[PDB]
C-alpha cells in the first residue's frame, strides 16, 4: 500500500522531444511522425513580444530559419505552418520512436503528467491538474516552453498540454496540441490575470477514499448529509459545487470501501468546518485535490501501461 | 518558476524492466547486459515464507525453472546465482537498451525516483527518500517486488533501490542492487518493525530556500541563531541534529538567496515553535523534508539529463 503523487512513465514521450531554434530563441518541440510541434512564439525576438503580429513575423521566415535538433542529429525542415498558437514544421524524417498517440483537450479538474524539458532534453517528470481558472501549478524555467503534458491509456499517449507562459503567482498557462489556449490567455507579453481558483471537490473526496483504502480512517464520522447541505458548506469554502454526476463518478470507490458518497461528504463537511487540528491524512496536512477518482483507482489497483 | 515533487525521466529504466516467474511467483526483474536481477524470494512459495532456507530452495532449482519475459519475448536463462538477497540470472541475450549505469548505496536523507512496476510493466513514477530508519514511504502493491529506485547524472543511471517488502504503517523496505537490505530487515515473513523516524533537517532548510527562490518569503524573520541553540529546539521535535557539514552543503542555496544558513535556521526555529497557523509554504501545510539541497538546485536551475 501507500499513496504517492505518481506520474506516468515518461519513456514514450522522451523519444519525441527535440530542440527548435529560430534566430535568437531556443525552446522545445514535439516530434511525431514527420511533424515537429512547438509554440509559435519561437519566431519572436524579445522586442516583438509586446504585441507580435505572428503572421507578419511568419511570412518573413523560411524553412531553413528553423533549426530542429534531435539530440546529436539535425533534421531538415521542408515546410512550416501555423495553427492557432502552435507552429507545425514538416521535416523530412518520420520519428522512428513515435508512439501511438492522440491529441486531447482536457477539462478543469482532470490531471496529467508533465515532462519538463530544456534544449530538447528531459529534466524531470511530475503530475499536476488543470485548475478551474485554466492554469496549472507547474515547475517551469526559461527554456521550458514546448514541454508537454500527457496521459497514457494502455499503449496510447494522449497529449493534452504544451507549455507557453508563466502568470502572476507562479502558475502556468499553455495550449492543447492544436494550439488553443486553455483559459483566456494570449501569447503576448502583456498584463494577464488568472481568475479565481476553486478546490476540485470530487478529487478531494477521491483522495479521502484513497486514505480509507490505505488504512487512514480517523476522519470518518457517523453522519450523512445531502448534496444541498454539503454544497451549502462547500461553497463558503470555495469548493466546487458537487453534482449528481460527481456522486456517480465516485461510485466505484464508494463500492470498494463500503462508505456511501454522501457519508464521505459528511466527513468532509466536518473536516472543512473543524480543520485537521494537527492531524495528517496520507502524510498531508491539507486536503489534496490533484487526484481524480480514476487516479485513485489506477494507483490502488495497479493499472500498468 | 513553481516547485513540484519531481521525478527523473524514467525512459532509460523502463527499457530494463522484465517479468520473472518461478513456479507460482511472478515479480519484476532488472535486465542490464546479459544479467537479470530480482529478489531472491521469487523462488519461494507462500509456505516457505515463514523461514525460508534460500540456499536449499535454490539448489533445488535449475535454469529452466526461471521464466524471464521481456515484453513479447522470452529470454533463455543459461545460469543463475544468488548474491545476498538478489538473484542473478545470466541470460543469453544482452539487453540492447542497457543504459550507462552504476550500482550505488544511498544514505539516509538522500532521495531517488521509483519506477513502480507490475508483471514487468511500468505503472508510474514517483520521488521519495531513504528515511533515517531505512524505510521509504512508497506506493507498492502485490507484484511490485523488483521495482527499482534510481538517480540520473548526465547520462548515467545510478541504481540504489530494489523493492522487497511492506512494513507496519505502510512503509517499505528493500535492498541495494548487490542484495543488501537497507536497515535491519530480512526477507522472511516474520514480525519486523520499522524504527523511530526523524525529520531530515538539512532537507527542510533546502526546501525553505526553494520557497524563497520562488517568492514565498513570509516566514523569514530577522533573527539569527547558533547550531547549539537550533539543535536544542530541533531535537525536542525529532528533527535530525544539524551539523557543520550540513551548513556547508547549504552554502550554494544561501549564496543564491543572500540568506545566511543560521538566519534560515532562526526562521525554522520559529516555524517549529510557533507552527504555520494556516499558512502554506510552496502549497504545503507541512514542513517538507524530501527535497535535498541538490534537488532544489537541480529544479530551480534546470539541470537536464
Ligand atoms: C517560454 O517561452 C520559454 O521557455 N522560452 C524559451 C526561453 C525563454 C527565456 C530564456 C531563454 C529561453 C517561457 C516559459 C516561462 C519563462 C519562465 N517560466 C515559464 O514558464 N514563456 C514566456 O516567456 C512567455 C512568452 C509567452 C508568449 C507570451 N512570457 C513572456 C513575457 C512574460 C511572461 N510571464 C511573466 O512576466 O510572469 C509574471 C509572473 C507576470 C512576472 C511570459 O511567461
Ligand atoms: C513482493 O514480494 C511482490 O510483489 N511479490 C509478487 C507477488 C506478491 C503477492 C501476490 C502476487 C505477486 C511483495 C510486495 C509487497 C506486497 C504488497 N505491497 C508490497 O510492497 N513483498 C512481499 O510480499 C514480502 C515478502 C518478503 C520476502 C519477505 N512480504 C511477505 C509477507 C508479509 C509482508 N508484509 C506484511 O505483512 O505487511 C504488514 C504491514 C506487516 C502487514 C511482505 O512484504
Describe the structure.
The structure is a homodimer of 305-residue chains. By secondary structure, the first copy, chain A, is an alpha+beta fold. Among the domains of chain A are: 11-91, Beta Barrel (Thrombin, subunit H); 201-300, Orthogonal Bundle (main proteinase (3clpro) structure, domain 3), CATH 1.10.1840.10. Chain A has helices at residues 11-14, 54-59, 201-213, 227-235, 244-257, 261-274, 293-301; strands at residues 17-22, 25-32, 35-39, 66-70, 73-75, 77-83, 86-91, 101-103, 111-118, 121-129, 148-153, 156-167, 171-175. In chain A, the strands form two sheets. Chain A has a seven-stranded antiparallel beta sheet with strand order 5-4-1-2-3-7-6, with no helix packed on it. In chain A, strands 8, 9, 10, 11, 12 and 13 form a six-stranded mixed beta sheet that branches. The radius of gyration of chain A is 22 Å and the shape is elongated. Chains A and B meet through strand 9, strand 10 and helix 7 of A and strand 9, strand 10 and helix 7 of B. Bound molecules: the ligand *[C@](O)(C(=O)NCc1ccccc1)[C@H](C[C@@H]1CCNC1=O)NC(=O)[C@H](CC1CC1)n1cccc(NC(=O)OC(C)(C)C)c1=O (2 copies). Chains A, B: Residues 1-305 form the Peptidase C30 domain.
